[PDB]
């Protein structure tokens, strides 16, 4: 009686199967073209990576690894695995004997989960950055009284601080407390973090107590392929992170391990990691993300993308410059990456209220706690990334004219604390910066040249899509 | 170097991933998918997909975010859960959704972590029964499945003389075991599951009772089989098998008295997830429109038709059914029926282009002999194939088996089956029939339609 | 102040009154009652000589020849003697098993060897608690675990057939498939049977687990030969070295020795190291002693027939309570005690209560499926080793029946609403309780009550 | 057998039931009389508790507690067990309206067990003096690849040291890695450490993190009750002990609680550690042991008794004192209690080589590390404690004495490890001081004196056995 109307709706481009969703996308699109997006985790994926996401790949269920699979039909996905093992070893500069990767993490979080599983039995002891020094949530996070994170709820984590007057992370105290909690792995990875990791030190506590050295490059494994920070991989045992952020590609993640001798006494690590993420965790592969990732890393050893990755560090520099330049302290006085933590106490404000008057004005940042911070519950900093604006093609006087941007921000958002007072409300505030002419007033001036700034830059990605 | 590829398309930018793409695509035009928890995804989903949607970062939920800039990811997010309540008829004031789960293994898991601790009691069905690793999954050493390492699972069993479940032997053991949690799904069960004696046990021992309902959560939606939201707390599933739409989980949960929502949201982030994948997000809100409309009804009902006719014609042509027979897309063969197993008939059917794999079914010789052959109609039906048309799929399968039984008779019955796999190859005599029949079920499969977009 | 050397020395008698009238009440009491508590028996005086030795002063963590302190000369002579005893009384060859006197108890040696074999979180299986299965195998609700055996560890427990009160053989073996035990316990606290340990051999090999006997309640059944051995096929017997085996309160733990499955055993040093630095501290010597000394008793002649009377004696006293029309689970029994399904309309949580104010000892059982214990547990040993035959054992069945009646009455007069109200006896009823109180002292005081001089 | 032959066995006395045993026996007493008892855990129990431990109180099994029972016929248990709390929490002066106690752990390792498993579920964090520094393997012991004590096994413990250059607990580091590991419990208790505990500063550490102070006052229990050290009931939760070593009871271990209100409301501790002695941990009560142990809290009470402890300490000062006047050093300078840590360093020599020297001398003491010492194998010290020996009568001067064998013995330790050759050790030394000529000759001498002097005191007990 049917079935012929059934054809075509699985036929038709989706602007015609479901306006709704499409204007959606169209809103977001124009979102993120007349905006300053400055999250240190965002980027724009290039055009290639997202054509491969769309892909019949989406239909095929290979569960397990080329060559080991449970289904038939995996011809192609095999080519497609293992070519994207291949560029993944390959972008990193790693040698196939002494390395092997995984590419099945379904994002970050899982491939860390991953990788605990695998070689830290359930409570085993985990050591990570404390959060509110710049750490992730997957690297361990409990209070007084409950688990929150679920690497804290299924396996034992304490973390390790940064020195409060330096903002540098405290390796001598790590190393002590090592001695003492017996960690069974150590995370080298930050969220907010804008120095490189002495990986040499970290690996020689790793040793001491017999630990494995996990490093989670998810912010910087873009600058690692590009060689503008030290490679994680010189040092680490194991080494994880996302495809997304500074790599550029779609969501997903990748498990690297050490291969070879750790003849005698040799690295179990692949069986183990490979069993964890299947039939371990995961079940079926995105291959159609895996695809993506793999565009991803052909696109990364491209001497363009060298050449962005400088840029990015470069625009860092010059933003971290100019609003030094303008009194603003940032923590550990500046960077060696892609992004900086404003310490917004030198303008007498915070970045739980800069938060909403820069959102407010279309420049994406979001708040965070700079070393000494009394309560997270007002957080006295702002963290600013450059990969997303520089790939966009801004240079350094264009961030210089962020920077001025980013700065008129904050003094509508101090201008704004004058009125609201010192004991004021963080719910007090959004109410008198949402109720007020003479802010609304400035805050649709600055929003509008924000916007007319971003406007005059490209989108990279499927066109206005 | 003031070149900028972050426009070249694909075609240019990576012809090595291309042609993997094209050559996948025209590998699955030509193939008899049979695979019971494949499907092909409509163009509308596949184009959002690739939308800007990748860009964004929203950690946390609607109202409740960490970053600045979700209008309309808040928008997004939202429309999906409105779009999942109602595809399955569900009351908002009763009913809750999370739409944020990666794909189905994490949903699962996360609510494990949610509403199990760590070391809680799970009970599912063992999986040579057609359970999911994700249902638990152990032996006498390395528990496979992670839901079986940082929890405690006891599994239940179909009875083995009618491929059903023994309900009456979870009854009794629950009462040993102590299950915090009961799983109510299969991923290679022909059959309905009780739900409502399901609740009673779960009631019983004051545990909750989860549905997994990935394999028919499309069924379900078209009310071609009972829904399992009228007995469960909580039912998960995944968003492709008979759904249709790409790759990714949602968390149901029951709401009003109960505080579900509160756990199972906190499970899936701050606790075992970071960034949400609103493309993919998206992705399922289009295929969940697509759910709702008649031309969905109908293809559910195909897909139950054609999986009748298909079980039928194997038993017309003497092939062992479990359970007799189906109630929904797939049906386990029992091989040995024909002198065989689906460890070495995978093998063949695959070379013939006719996808499909082996299945541990009911005992048997467990992951060593698998006495079966799990097939599914969603996939093939949604390339439009009628009755008539799977009867002649199962002959195309049957011949595939005759020259299975063949292989193996030829095959040591040591049965080296580890070099079954380099019998086949090589040797011109077997790879010259691989070739005959392949022939014809691609020229078969091809005067049908294949969902996507081009010819990519 | 200027003394204390007196205190040092000066008797019990008179540095403390209190405790001693105590002591003085308590072997009065014990010597007029019917003592039919299953799990009770009357050490002997050498055993409690030895008690009060000056063992009680040395510490000596861990074990001869590896000790960590010094002077130890003795206690190693102790300690070694009473394992070489252990091993004798049960017709052990040392090349095959060993043994760890150093449990501090029944509930003590058995955690240890859990802990020893069995990581946290490893899967147990044990005879349910209310089918006669004991605390230390296992036990937890729909709610919570009660057992520490159960808290740092995953216990499943399988059940007795309601309709014979004999175990489930059959369901142990299906359940051990889905369950996966990595430690399966062939030991009761309230069955009146032997345990098919071959059958409980050939399951455990199955899935690979240990078989672990726990013969508390039958040790002394069992080296007298009056009950089939459990080292016959366990690959480890813990058991306590009171109740049948008549000695001071302590544990042990038997292993095997030699090599498993071999084709080119190391439970030993997992179990030694599980008690020590593992799970206890310094060991009890004074207590080693006692064992060591009820070991030798143990192997006496006198000994061997004690537990057959004992044998003997419940099996009379299960005849003449059926005769007397009570409900005997599984028909009879094959040791020491039987449980009485008290059904004659009542209850052992009553029943328990009366029978005490008629100072007939016996505690209520938890029979098959209601809070409401449905029967009585009753057993031999302490009574038998007091000398009583069948004759006697039979006007203790009639005086127990007496009880019973004197019960199921006031269970009519009562609520039904029991409680803390039952827990009333009137006079109608306390002079009733008296007279038979009184006929039980009486016939009670004719026999000898072992051990030192209530006095 | 005749029934006669059966109720003699079950009547003769030790003597001639057992030859053997009695004989064992025997030599032991002789031992423990000529012998100098010098270990710091060593006491001799009274007559009286000794008499009570061979009652016939031995036999009646009641599981649960006074009121609620499982067996019947407890009507003298109840009075035996009522009683003997009443003692317990007279004796330290303690409030039955804030305080409770429970007398059934088998020992003082079952009581300690018996609190984590109520107030700390598995895998919950306990913190605890490291073992090295003197803490007890109950208090939680594990190594950078195995948990040894069934503390660390069950539970996730994590010590806490002394400072190397102080001997002290360094409360400072205690306090900034409890906010690290939010423990759930710490305790409060040694088992070689001659000062007091700052219970007062372990309670607001403890308070800080929601965690639960329990103390573990089993090596100066005694010196407690008679008020000779300050009290860890002004400021533990929970406190648990052995009742014999400077108790002088028999062998068994107590659980002190608080009742009332914590600042809520209030305490729930009683229902917990109850519940976890049974039917959680134990059995059947040892009544004969509680018996002995409420003697001996009987004792505990009068002034003979705070006149003993007095002079326990008393002698540790003279002890001390006159040690150091011969050169050898004390770590910390001295001690506040019963016991105190030589340093054997001052002399040349380590712990382990004159543990053996000084046994085979009749002068029993146990060999222990120092504060910093080169990871064990070779510890530096010996503990000395004075309980056994003055509960003998020794006063000031016969320590003295007692110092100077000590001190010969320490000699002859060095005049033979004169002839080891410094590297040339361990199996090596025993070899060469029961070898070779002189030594024995010496050792024979010493141990001689030592005996003599020995003999020269009364010994506890049932006069004899
Ligand atoms: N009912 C049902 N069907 C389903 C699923 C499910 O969850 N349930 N799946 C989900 O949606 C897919 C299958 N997924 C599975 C993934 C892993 C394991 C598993 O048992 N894992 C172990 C042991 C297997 C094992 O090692 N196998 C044998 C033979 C090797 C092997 O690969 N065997 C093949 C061929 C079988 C044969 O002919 O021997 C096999 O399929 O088991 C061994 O001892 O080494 C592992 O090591 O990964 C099982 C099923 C498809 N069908
Ligand atoms: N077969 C057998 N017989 C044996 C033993 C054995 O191990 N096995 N024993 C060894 O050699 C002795 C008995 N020892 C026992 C010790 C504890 C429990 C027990 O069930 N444990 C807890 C449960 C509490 C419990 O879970 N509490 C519930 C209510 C259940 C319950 O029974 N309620 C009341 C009792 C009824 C009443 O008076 O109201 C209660 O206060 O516990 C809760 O509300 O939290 C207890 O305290 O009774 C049973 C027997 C003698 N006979
Ligand atoms: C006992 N002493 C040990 C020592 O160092 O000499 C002890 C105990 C254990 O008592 P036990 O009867 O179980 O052997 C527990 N806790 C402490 C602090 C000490 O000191
Ligand atoms: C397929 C399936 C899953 C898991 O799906 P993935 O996204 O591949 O993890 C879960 N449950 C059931 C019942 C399934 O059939
Ligand atoms: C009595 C008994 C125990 C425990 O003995 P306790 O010394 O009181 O802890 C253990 N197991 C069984 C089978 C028992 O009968």
Aim: charged letters at 25%; glycine letters at 10%; hydrophobic letters at 35%.
């Amino acid at each position: 009686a049917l079935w012929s109307s059934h054809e075509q709706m699985l036929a038709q481009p989706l602007k015609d199967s479901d306006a709704e969703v499409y204007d959606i996308i169209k809103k977001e699109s124009n979102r993120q073209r007349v905006g300053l997006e400055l999250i240190a985790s965002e980027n724009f994926a290039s055009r290639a990576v997202l054509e491969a996401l769309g892909s019949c790949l989406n239909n095929k269920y290979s569960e397990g690894y080329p060559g080991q699979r449970y289904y038939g039909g995996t011809e192609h996905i095999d080519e497609l695995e293992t070519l994207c093992q291949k560029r993944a070893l390959q972008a990193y500069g790693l040698d196939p004997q002494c390395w092997g990767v995984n590419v099945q993490p379904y994002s970050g979080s899982p491939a860390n989960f991953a990788v605990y599983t695998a070689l830290v039995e359930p409570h085993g002891r985990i050591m990570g950055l404390d959060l509110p020094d710049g750490g992730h949530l997957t690297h361990g996070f409990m209070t007084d009284k409950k688990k929150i994170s679920a690497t804290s709820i299924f396996f034992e984590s304490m973390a390790y601080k940064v020195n409060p007057d330096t903002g540098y992370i405290d390796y001598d105290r790590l190393e002590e407390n090592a001695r003492l909690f017996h960690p069974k792995l150590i995370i080298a990875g930050t969220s907010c973090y804008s120095r490189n990791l002495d990986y040499g030190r970290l690996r020689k506590i790793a040793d001491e107590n017999g630990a494995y050295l996990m490093a989670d490059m998810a912010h910087i494994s873009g600058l690692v392929v590009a060689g503008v920070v030290p490679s994680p991989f010189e040092h680490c045992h194991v080494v994880t992170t996302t495809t997304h952020k500074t790599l550029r590609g779609c969501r997903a993640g990748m498990i690297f391990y050490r291969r070879g001798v750790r003849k005698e006494i040799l690295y179990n690590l692949e069986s183990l990691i490979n069993s964890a993420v299947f039939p371990g965790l995961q079940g079926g592969p995105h291959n159609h993300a895996i695809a993506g990732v793999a565009v991803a890393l052909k696109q990364a050893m491209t001497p363009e993308f060298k050449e962005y990755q400088r840029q990015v560090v470069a625009n860092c520099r010059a933003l971290s410059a100019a609003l030094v330049e303008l009194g603003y302290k940032i923590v550990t006085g500046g960077s060696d990456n892609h992004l900086i933590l404003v310490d917004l106490r030198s303008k007498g404000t915070d970045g739980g209220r800069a938060e909403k008057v820069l959102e407010a004005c279309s420049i994406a940042c979001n708040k965070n706690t700079c070393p000494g911070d009394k309560s997270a519950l007002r957080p006295s900093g702002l963290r600013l990334g450059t990969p997303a604006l520089t790939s966009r093609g801004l240079l350094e006087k264009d961030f210089q004219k962020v920077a001025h941007f980013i700065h008129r921000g904050i003094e509508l958002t101090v201008q704004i604390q004058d009125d609201t007072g010192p004991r004021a409300t963080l719910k007090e505030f959004k109410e008198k910066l949402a109720g007020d002419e003479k802010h609304q007033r400035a805050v649709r001036a600055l929003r509008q040249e924000v916007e007319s700034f971003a406007a005059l830059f490209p989108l990279p990605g499927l066109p206005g899509f």
